[PDB]
Amino acid sequence: AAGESMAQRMVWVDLEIEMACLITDSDLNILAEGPNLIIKITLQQAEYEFLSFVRQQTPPGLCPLAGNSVHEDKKFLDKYMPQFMKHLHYRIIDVSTVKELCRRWYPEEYEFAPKHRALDDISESIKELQFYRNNIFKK
Amino acid sequence: AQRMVWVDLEMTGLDIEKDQIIEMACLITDSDLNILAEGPNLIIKDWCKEHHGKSGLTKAVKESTITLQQAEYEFLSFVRQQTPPGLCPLAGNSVHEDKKFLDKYMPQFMKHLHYRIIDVSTVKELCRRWYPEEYEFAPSHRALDDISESIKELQFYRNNIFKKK
Ligand SMILES: [Mg+2]
Ligand SMILES: [Mg+2]
Report all structural domains of chain A as residue ranges with CATH numbers, in order of start. 4-136 (3.30.420.10)
Alpha-carbon distance B94 to B122, whole Å?
A: 10
* Rounded to 5°, angle at Cα A102 from A6 and A122: 45
Helix, strand, coil tally for chain A in percent (to 5): 50, 20, 30
How far from A115 is each of A122, A125, B10, CA to CA, in Å? 12, 9, 36
Local structure of B24: helix, strand or coil: strand
Residue B121 contacts A where some CB pair is shorter than 8 Å: yes
Query: Do A114 and A131 contact (CB within 8 A), yes or no?
Result: yes
CA dihedral A26, A58, A44, A77 (to 10 degrees): -40
How far from B129 is each of A8, A25, A85, B126, CA to CA, in Å? 7, 10, 21, 5
Alpha-carbon distance A13 to A58, whole Å?
A: 14
Per the annotation, does B146 bind a ligand?
A: yes
Alpha-carbon distance B13 to B153, whole Å?
A: 25
Residues A75, B164: C-beta atoms closer than 8 Å = no
**Given A75, A96, A137, which is nearest B161 (Cβ)?**
A137
Per the annotation, does B8 bind a ligand?
A: yes
Q: What is the DSSP-derived secondary structure letter of residue B164? A: P
* Cα four-point dihedral sign B160, A136, A97, A32: negative
* Rounded to 5°, angle at Cα A11 from A10 and A13: 140
Query: What was the structure determination method?
Result: X-ray
Q: What are the φ/ψ torsions at residue A23 (nearest 5 degrees)? A: -110, 140
- Would you call A87 a catalytic residue per the annotation? no
- Where does B10-142 have alpha helices with state H? 47-53, 57-63, 68-82, 95-105, 107-112, 120-130, 132-136
Alpha-carbon distance B142 to B25, whole Å?
A: 9
Residues A138, B2: C-beta atoms closer than 8 Å = no
Query: Do A19 and A50 contact (CB within 8 A), yes or no?
Result: yes
Resolution of the coordinates, Å: 2.2
- The neighbour count for residue B119, using CB atoms within 10 Å, is 30
Alpha-carbon distance B150 to B163, whole Å?
A: 20
A91: chain B residues, CB-CB within 8 Å: 121-122, 124-125
How far from B71 is each of B41, B105, B162, CA to CA, in Å? 9, 11, 37
A106: chain B residues, CB-CB within 8 Å: 163
Local structure of B54: helix, strand or coil: coil
Among chain B residues, CA nearest to A98: B123
Q: How far is CA B88 from the centre of its chain?
A: 14
Q: What are the φ/ψ torsions at residue A64 (nearest 5 degrees)? A: -90, 150
Query: Do A122 and A19 contact (CB within 8 A), yes or no?
Result: no
Alpha-carbon distance B16 to B139, whole Å?
A: 29
